[PDB]
Amino acid sequence: MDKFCNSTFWDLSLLESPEADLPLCFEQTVLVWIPLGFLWLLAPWQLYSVYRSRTKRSSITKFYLAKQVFVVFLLILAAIDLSLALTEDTGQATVPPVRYTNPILYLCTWLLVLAVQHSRQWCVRKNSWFLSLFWILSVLCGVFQFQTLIRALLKDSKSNMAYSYLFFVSYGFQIVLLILTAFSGPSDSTQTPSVTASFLSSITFSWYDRTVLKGYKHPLTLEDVWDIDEGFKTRSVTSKFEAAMTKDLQKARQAFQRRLQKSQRTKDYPKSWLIKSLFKTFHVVILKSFILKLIHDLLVFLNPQLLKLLIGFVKSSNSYVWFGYICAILMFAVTLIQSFCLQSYFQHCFVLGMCVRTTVMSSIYKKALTLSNLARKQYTIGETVNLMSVDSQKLMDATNYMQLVWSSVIQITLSIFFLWRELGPSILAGVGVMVLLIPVNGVLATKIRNIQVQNMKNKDKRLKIMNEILSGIKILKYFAWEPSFQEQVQGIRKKELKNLLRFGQLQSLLIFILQITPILVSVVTFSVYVLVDSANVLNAEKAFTSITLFNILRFPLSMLPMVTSSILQASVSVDRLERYLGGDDLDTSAIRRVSNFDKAVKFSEASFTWDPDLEATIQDVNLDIKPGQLVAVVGTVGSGKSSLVSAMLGEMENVHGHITIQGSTAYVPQQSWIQNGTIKDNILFGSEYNEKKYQQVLKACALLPDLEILPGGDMAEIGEKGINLSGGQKQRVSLARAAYQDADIYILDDPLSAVDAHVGKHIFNKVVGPNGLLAGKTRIFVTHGIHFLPQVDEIVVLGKGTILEKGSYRDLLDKKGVFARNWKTFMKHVKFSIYLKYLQAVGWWSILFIILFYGLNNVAFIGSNLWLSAWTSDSDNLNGTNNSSSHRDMRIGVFGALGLAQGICLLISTLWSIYACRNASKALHGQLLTNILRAPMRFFDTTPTGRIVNRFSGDISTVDDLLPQTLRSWMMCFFGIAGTLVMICMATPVFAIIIIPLSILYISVQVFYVATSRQLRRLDSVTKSPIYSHFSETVTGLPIIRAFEHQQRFLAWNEKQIDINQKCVFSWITSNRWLAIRLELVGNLVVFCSALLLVIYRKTLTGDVVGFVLSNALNITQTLNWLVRMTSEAETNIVAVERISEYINVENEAPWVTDKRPPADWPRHGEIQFNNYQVRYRPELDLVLKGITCNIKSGEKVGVVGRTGAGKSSLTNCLFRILESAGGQIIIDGIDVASIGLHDLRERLTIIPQDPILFSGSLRMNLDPFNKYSDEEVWRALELAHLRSFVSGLQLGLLSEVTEGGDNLSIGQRQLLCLGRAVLRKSKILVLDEATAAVDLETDSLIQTTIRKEFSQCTVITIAHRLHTIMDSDKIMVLDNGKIVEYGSPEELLSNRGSFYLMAKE
Ligand SMILES: CC(C)CCC[C@@H](C)[C@H]1CC[C@H]2[C@@H]3CC=C4C[C@@H](OC(=O)CCC(=O)O)CC[C@]4(C)[C@H]3CC[C@]12C
């Protein structure tokens, strides 16, 4: 052990000296076999694994050649070393055996290295963990020999120069080899760099650099985010989940069947298989993350020990200089290793969470396409979309939290043990305090969650009322109702503000508890430890290692209740998900899709039922249809024709009797379903584009005139936003899609509901007629009209869920029996300006005082640490300072006082912040709501309603929820950083200089991160939204998809969308880890520079200063990273204030009241005069009304029907001053609208909208929200509207609840209510507007009679497009191209040489 080197093996005497150097024998002994030992103990395994499983990949690039060249240079160097050693035999007496046995080992090990490097070419990771770790170990274990040789040669020791020079060259080449191994290999551009990067890069996430640079120069486009590897793509993980889930689902299903049969001898579903299956399918990543976290946790408790060693070294005045530096270097190395481990664990955990969300969403979709009818009925579209949107996120969060709920326990236990070893059994006081603080955290978390749910509900109701307000802003501005509809939502917002303030107070309390736990624990533990006994003393090692352990334990202590609460929530979410997935699949035994048969349709005594709990809807049926034969099944309402079609599709359950169907089928229902996108893609429906067939199906249907009518043309847009296509157009496009799909059989279910006579007849003749495009294709038609009955070739009559007889129209006219009576019954007819705006909303005094009080908190904290330093120092002297109860009591009291001052200052800061942010949100929403209203109608016409609704929902929610927390967190992080830096610089002022470059470095990283992160965030928001929406689109129209047999196409599309979102979210996760590695390196650099400065100045500052400098420099590693992430979040969610301020500054119309007031009756019950008028719908675009002048007398029923131009509809808009009059004005009995107010004039003028809309709520304020009319007057008003009967049958009174939809307040009721409102307005000027011919004639007759009998004395306008109801007008006005050429009564109009206008009487 010593004879083989001819030198001293171990000698601690050299170490125990100011200039210490390790013995050369041990140095060439152990520091040489350690890297070679690591290499030779694993090289066979790596070589075998690579050579056994390998492809034919092989290339020779610059890197492979360079690494091989340098390794053979190492080979040559070891060879010449051996040559020199053997030659020196005659130089000396007997060379030591080491001098000539090391070169042989180096030769063999470099041959092994050459083989390893060559073998790596087969694999895909060129520089894997083995080689990089070997190089790192070699460099680290050789730096000792390098320094020893250089130190020996330094002191003029001219001995064996050649060997030293050769070792220097070999070490330099090893350094360059490690440098090369760090670099990522050249890329094949067929895989994402995450899988082809070198081990050091994959550890340090430097392979992301390119993307970040790509984000800084130009905005990131969805094509610039690298794809994910095939491991995480939704198809692969979903297949793995299904494989590992089928067995568990079968076991749970059999157990559920056994339980049900035992109970019987709906709330029970096969459960407790989702968690088992997910764990079984992800156990590998679960284990990798668990081991990585365990290593990091065992590695996080080395920093306090190193700090204790450093304090002990500085305290001793005879300590060796060569120490201390070793402690600082070790602290840097441990922090680096721990940061690498932690970030890799985070990447593993987050990617596992994202994969869990992917597999759950994809399994949801795959189940939605085969769910049985009953299970589909048990849910709803909104609820199921919410399930996929929310429960999957809950499961992802639970996955992220499960790997941490155990690491927190390990960290707490180890930290408790180490605190015990430091401070004796007196840490139980700290244990008690910080355990009593845990149920408080749990309770606060639960209360916060409940208040958040209540806030969500209130925000939903506010969104609903806001959307209703914005949809019908037209009539709202017409009737001058803005103050009332503003006050209602103002009250709702006040209630939401109260709830939000409560939530903010609870969050502030929770964060105050988290921030004050370490201070309270420190005070209590130190006080109890000193007071419990006089023997034990508090020195700088115990106190500051204990503070470091308290800081280590603060987070996992406060992250237990949150994780627990989230786990108990995900429990219910998992139960819901596995209740959905466990529902049985739909049955296909009855409906057999036989490949080849006769007539393609056979009803083998089928008996289908909507619900087994009820009587069979249809039973004992028998019908066969020849191929190519049109069948028009008809019957009474509710007979079961729609039920018959559903049974044909197989969307219903049956008791007995199978149905045999052959060939492909197409189907169109009465309720047409339209996907999001283009009309073209709707028509193709995933089939190949064919211009000929496309043109044919446009010609066959009525779509070309509609397409030319459409604004966007063939592409245009439809769905979601769309253009609000009419029902007839939807039916037409669905019929066209069915025709294009060219199936063998067609199932038409009332596709001509909102279709006129001639157009529907043409469509039938050209599509489903004898000469239609589907002559060779059989069709089963459901119809209600009689025009198409003569064209049927096989008509079946359906009654009470049972067919009666078959036949054709010839049978109809021949039998004169059942068919005759049936037919007879049938036809009977950013920049700082935005931050300034938000802060000004907050209030400058409030932010000034918040900043001042947080600064006072940090000053108190620095004072507390200085006092602890002095308290620990007083033990070293022991020259009368101690051994007195007064001194110890004063120390304890002042320490407690400083802790209390810090606590109350921080609490005052946070409470003031909460109140200021609440006030700011209130003011911002008030301003935005006030200014959106009273805005001119042009702004509403241009901007879509969805845009303003999103501005009121999402941006206001951001401003009220995520902006205060982000700004407070930024201030917290920044003042933590400033306190720590000004407390490190208080000991060694030289450190101030190192702030100059470090900050610059930090700044650089931040900039790059921001310039990418924003974009990634945006990309996520752009791609997450479609998935959910598509799910709705594929779950509302499930019968259509099942009929067309296009299931796999929809499944593939959903998988594609999931992958497109997955790549964005994965790139975001990696960007977070990239920034975290960089900034944890910056914080670690801060702690290492501080430790080096403390060691250098060890002869000036005592050990207590080292303790309180390092114990806080160790806490800065994460604060920098979180400061940058909070800066990025503040930049991301400040755009809400930007948009709100953009919408506040919108233009406003004429003011409410312009000083001058009208008399008691502004209309003066008299005439009106139109002077020279020059008015356009929007300014300087195109004048509409030009060169018109007229005078309408009192009580005149003046009607105007000009032409098809917009000039017909302009007058009303010009009568309420909605359109500003550029030329002339309007005189009404000497009263000019120009020189008078606006809202007062609109309030006392009436108008019937052409498209009236309803306001949600009651019926009293939907009629008169101002409540300025007595209930008797309102009742009389409905009495002339004869709506008294409807409300009397409904909830009696004026305050009956009303809502949208046809359930309540049907179209006739709506028209009656509008007429009543108009007649009770009681203004002498009446303006009408009619645009729809679908209104019932009785309603028109009654409103005309009541107008003529009540409003005859009042002037009326009657803007009516129809001609058959205007001859009764007293006067008729005609306006052409914006000009009037005639004036007089209808008799005078027809007196002009005979029908000179409105000639067309039909
Ligand atoms: C992305 C989601 C998970 C939001 C995460 C919130 C964190 C980014 C915020 C919330 C609480 C903040 C922490 C709360 C307390 C502090 C104490 C601070 O150290 C001190 O100030 C000493 C204690 C004292 O001053 O009394 C270091 C920053 C830190 C960890 C803050 C860093 C940023 C945190 C973790």
Ligand SMILES: CCCN(CCC)S(=O)(=O)c1ccc(C(=O)O)cc1
């Ligand atoms: C929602 C997860 C909660 N966590 C558990 C992770 C295993 S977490 O520890 O608090 C954390 C850490 C780091 C980041 C980040 O870098 O964005 C986010 C969250």
Ligand SMILES: CCCN(CCC)S(=O)(=O)c1ccc(C(=O)O)cc1
């Ligand atoms: C949400 C905050 C996340 N951080 C805490 C900052 C105070 S963190 O630095 O990223 C971190 C650190 C350590 C552990 C662990 O030990 O499990 C987890 C997360």
